[PDB]
Design a protein around this nucleic acid. Structure first.
Ligand SMILES: [Mg+2]
Ligand SMILES: [Mg+2]
Ligand SMILES: [Mg+2]
Ligand SMILES: [Mg+2]
Ligand SMILES: [Mg+2]
Ligand SMILES: [Mg+2]
Ligand SMILES: [Mg+2]
Ligand SMILES: [Mg+2]
Ligand SMILES: [Mg+2]
Ligand SMILES: [Mg+2]
Ligand SMILES: [Mg+2]
Ligand SMILES: [Mg+2]
Ligand SMILES: [Mg+2]
Ligand SMILES: [Mg+2]
Ligand SMILES: [Mg+2]
Ligand SMILES: [Mg+2]
Ligand SMILES: [Mg+2]
Ligand SMILES: [Mg+2]
Lengths: 71, 141, 98, 78, 179, 50
RNA sequence: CUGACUGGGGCCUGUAGAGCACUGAUAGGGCUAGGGGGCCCACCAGCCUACCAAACCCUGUCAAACUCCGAAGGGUCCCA
RNA sequence: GGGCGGUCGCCUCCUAAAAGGUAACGGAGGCGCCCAAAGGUCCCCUCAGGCGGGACGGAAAUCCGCCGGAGAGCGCAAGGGUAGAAGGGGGCCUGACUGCGAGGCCUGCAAGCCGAGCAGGGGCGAAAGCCGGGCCUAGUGAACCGGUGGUCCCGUGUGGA
RNA sequence: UCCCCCGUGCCCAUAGCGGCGUGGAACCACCCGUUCCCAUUCCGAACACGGAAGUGAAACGCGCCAGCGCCGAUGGUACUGGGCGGGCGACCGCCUGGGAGAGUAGGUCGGUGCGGGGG
């Protein structure tokens, strides 16, 4: 036990982001968002940054056919 | 020459030369062996003078085997110095050998060339050292 | 390989051995360098009471009256694996007196 | 060119002073030992410098047997 | 009390049957202890010891960790005897699951790296140091006592022998895979 | 020698001494001690400058 | 009648001898932490080292200040 | 041979010939100290390394598991011994007492060392039991002349000094 | 008058190490909790207390496996009191007794007391 420096860990409720958070143990009730953020086989939780969010007029096929004109 | 690179103590004693061999009679490495017969010391100059007299004698084949190692420092006082006042300086490490111990063992050298080579290196040593060949006198069961 | 071995000193040459299992306890009194157990009082060999720490009073009176019945007084006490805490088997007869 | 080291300590002169099969009195030193080469048995006491002596008088006996060290046993006479 | 205990009892104990295990009662693998260490971070954060990681650590899991000594004065890293530098704690109870279910669900998001951690960090006899980097940003602590990066180190010790028998447990308990 | 400050402990009420040191370098300043006198039967003892 | 010495019983040692399990040096052989390094490759995605070499295991050794071992003897005590 | 140089005391190992002793201007080294805890009692734990890992990390900081029986440590050089503690951690205390001390080791003598136990009064432990300093061997100096406290013993006819 | 298990011993690695079995009705261990007497540089892991619904997985006992380790015989010298000789020396030879250490055969994974429980 050792009552003393060891606190009682007063109950406080977290804001229940991804289902029910593991319940009232610590007095820190605040997260940013999205406790799990995915089901955790990591189902492509993307926010479409500098990579292929803009896919029009680049990473495309322009300037004619599939380039039979080569030789 | 050669010398042991590390020692517990620098100087040590002499002792006696009795006892038969305390190991080192069976060859177990080569096909021949130069075996001693009289108790004496083997200086590193006697090791070098007998080791050069093999590689300069026979060439291009035959590995030479030495089974002697000097760990006894020969202690000699400087010249024109009276007695006492501590021990002398260390000049060259010597190797104690017993009679019936095999010192030099040629490898890959035939009969008529190994008898000659061990005969040349036999005169570099102050000991009556006869020559033995590979026999069935091993320590196997 | 845990052992404390408070049984190693043996200045007093006559000790009371104590074994506490997790179910019940039992105790003996040994005579040293001879290997003869004089008297003993064992729970579930005489099956005195169910609660394991309430055993110590009745086996203290029982082993005390059997020790005085066998006529040995100057005894001792071991503490080999266990702390002197919880069960005490305190007595007021026999020279252990604790 | 002088003598480097030529001094030596005076011997403290340890050793076994009472062998077994010897009648002793209460207080005889059984062995003067440097370290505890002998472990106390019955009626044997140690001192400051690991010296063990007899507590009672009688015929002494060694080597009850090993696995912990050599034993000294001052056995009384009956 | 109960914190993902249904995933502890009917997602582990019958799941370790028909493909793993010798299917008696106790050689099915389970959790014995999960040690957690500070180890000063990089080096000594101060010349004199300050004992505040016991306070924010007692905030995040509500218990004081023992500040233990140092070894022989090698003095290449100004090593010394005394003035304890340990900050180690095991604390195995249901209080283990009180904090381990918090960091089990809060630490895999809310810190940025490649998605997850090594399945090659398993060791012999199944004791598995997992080794998170820092987490003083979002262990829901709100920047309390920002001295340095000041991470910690976790080892979740299983019971069974092989890495396939701890690997049988841990990502069926919810760990990531292939870094 | 010259660090030990070898001294003797006084009766702290009447007369005797006990002859044991107390270091001046390490701050072992004004160390109380109980010791056995002859007449006063295990009273307290303190230092003296000699 | 205890003595020098001798016979019957114990106890003790670490010398001769022997040995490498301990403390060090060691003639080779195998394995190769790694290092001038790398044939030279989007660097780890290698390959043999006829380059060096840590540590380990064998065939072999040496020791007054090494002993896992260990006499012949000597000392001591009881009886004759 | 003397002078020059080195040494003069104590401890450790060998020389040293298996009891003890044993020399040389023989070899290898240390000391003129230190700890109110580095002491006593009581209660817990077993080390150093190697392997598999780590978040920084030298291949040594700190943590986990296995192997590891003593190759670590025990203030200090070396030897002995030690985990069935003398080693590391914590509580309480100062026996780091006073009067003695049977019986001994060794010694030419002087010295040096062990000391069960008796009384008074303690400390620790519930007790059994231990404690008259330090795990041990070096860390010192006979005698004479005086210094500081107590003792009120003598104090030169008497009382005092 | 016998087997199994638990305490406590003596033999001092022929007792251990490593692998393979096996046992809980019967003790013992494991386990479920901590509520108080108790505790942790931190934690009921180890001490402590209620138990005991589940178990012999781990540990613990018994049984097997000689390689791992250990013990290790008869001869044979090395060595040596004691006596007699040789060699210029380094050092050797004979007799009388004594008698190793390695190595080889082989042995072993225990032997034997006291007090309790069950049949
Ligand atoms: Mg053990
Ligand atoms: Mg203990
Ligand atoms: Mg215990
Ligand atoms: Mg007579
Ligand atoms: Mg006589
Ligand atoms: Mg005789
Ligand atoms: Mg020798
Ligand atoms: Mg020899
Ligand atoms: Mg004899
Ligand atoms: Mg001697
Ligand atoms: Mg002699
Ligand atoms: Mg101490
Ligand atoms: Mg103790
Ligand atoms: Mg005298
Ligand atoms: Mg000390
Ligand atoms: Mg007058
Ligand atoms: Mg007058
Ligand atoms: Mg000559």
């Amino acid at each position: 036990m050792k009552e003393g420096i060891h606190p009682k860990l007063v109950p406080a409720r977290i804001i229940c982001g991804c289902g029910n958070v593991i319940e009232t143990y610590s007095t820190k009730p605040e997260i940013y968002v999205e406790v799990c953020s995915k089901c955790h086989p990591f189902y492509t939780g993307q926010q479409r940054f500098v990579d292929t969010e803009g896919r029009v007029e680049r990473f495309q096929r322009r300037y004619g056919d599939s380039y039979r004109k080569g030789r | 020459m050669l010398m042991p690179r590390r020692m517990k103590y620098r100087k040590q004693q002499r002792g006696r030369l009795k006892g038969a061999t305390k190991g080192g009679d069976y060859v177990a490495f080569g096909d021949y062996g130069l075996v001693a017969l009289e108790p004496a010391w083997i200086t590193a100059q006697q090791i070098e003078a007998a080791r050069v007299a093999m590689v300069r004698h026979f060439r291009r084949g035959g590995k030479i085997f030495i089974r002697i190692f000097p760990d006894k420092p020969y202690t000699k006082k400087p010249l024109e110095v009276r007695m006492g006042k501590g021990k002398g300086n260390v000049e060259g490490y010597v190797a104690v050998v017993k009679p019936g111990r095999v010192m030099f063992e040629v490898a890959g050298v035939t009969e008529e060339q190994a008898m000659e080579a061990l005969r040349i290196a036999g005169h570099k040593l102050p000991i009556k050292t006869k020559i033995v060949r590979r026999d069935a006198y091993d320590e196997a069961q | 390989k845990f052992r404390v071995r408070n049984r190693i000193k043996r200045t007093g040459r006559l000790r009371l051995s104590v074994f506490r299992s997790l179910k019940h306890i039992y105790a003996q009194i040994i005579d040293d360098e001879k290997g003869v157990t004089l008297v003993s009082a064992s729970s579930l060999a005489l099956k005195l009471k169910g609660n394991k720490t309430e055993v110590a009073r009745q086996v203290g009176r029982a082993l005390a009256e059997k020790a005085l019945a066998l006529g040995i007084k100057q005894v001792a006490f071991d503490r080999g694996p266990y702390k002197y805490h919880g069960r005490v088997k305190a007595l007021a007869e026999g020279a252990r007196e604790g | 060119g002088s003598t480097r080291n030529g001094r030596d300590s005076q011997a403290k002169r340890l050793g076994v002073k009472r062998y077994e099969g010897q009648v002793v009195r209460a207080g005889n030193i059984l062995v003067r030992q440097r370290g505890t080469r002998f472990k106390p048995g019955k009626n044997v006491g140690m001192g400051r410098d690991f010296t063990l002596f007899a507590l009672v008088d009688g015929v002494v006996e060694f080597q009850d047997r090993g696995r912990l060290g050599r034993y000294v046993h001052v056995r009384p006479l009956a | 009390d109960v914190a993902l205990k249904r995933k502890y009892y009917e997602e582990v104990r019958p799941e370790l049957i028909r493909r793993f295990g010798y299917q008696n009662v106790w050689e099915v693998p389970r959790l014995e202890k999960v040690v957690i260490n500070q180890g000063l971070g990089e080096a000594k954060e101060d010349a004199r010891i300050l004992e505040k990681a016991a306070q924010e650590l007692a905030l995040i899991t509500g218990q004081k960790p023992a500040v233990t000594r140092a070894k022989k004065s090698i003095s290449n890293f100004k090593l010394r005897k005394g003035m304890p530098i340990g900050l180690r704690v095991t604390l195995r109870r249901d209080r283990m699951w009180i904090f381990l279910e918090k960091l089990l669900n809060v630490a895999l998001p809310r810190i940025r790296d490649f998605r997850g951690l090594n399945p090659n960090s398993f060791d012999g006899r199944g004791n598995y140091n997992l080794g998170l980097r820092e987490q003083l940003i979002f262990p829901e602590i709100t920047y309390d006592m920002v001295d340095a990066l000041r991470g910690m180190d976790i080892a979740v010790v299983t019971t069974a022998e092989t890495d396939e028998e701890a690997r049988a447990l841990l990502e069926l308990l919810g760990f990531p895979f292939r870094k | 020698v010259r660090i030990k400050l070898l001294l003797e402990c006084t009766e702290c009420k009447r007369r005797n001494y006990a002859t044991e040191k107390n270091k001046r370098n390490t701050p072992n300043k004004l160390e109380l001690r109980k010791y056995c006198p002859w007449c006063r039967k295990h009273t307290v003892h303190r230092e003296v400058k000699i």
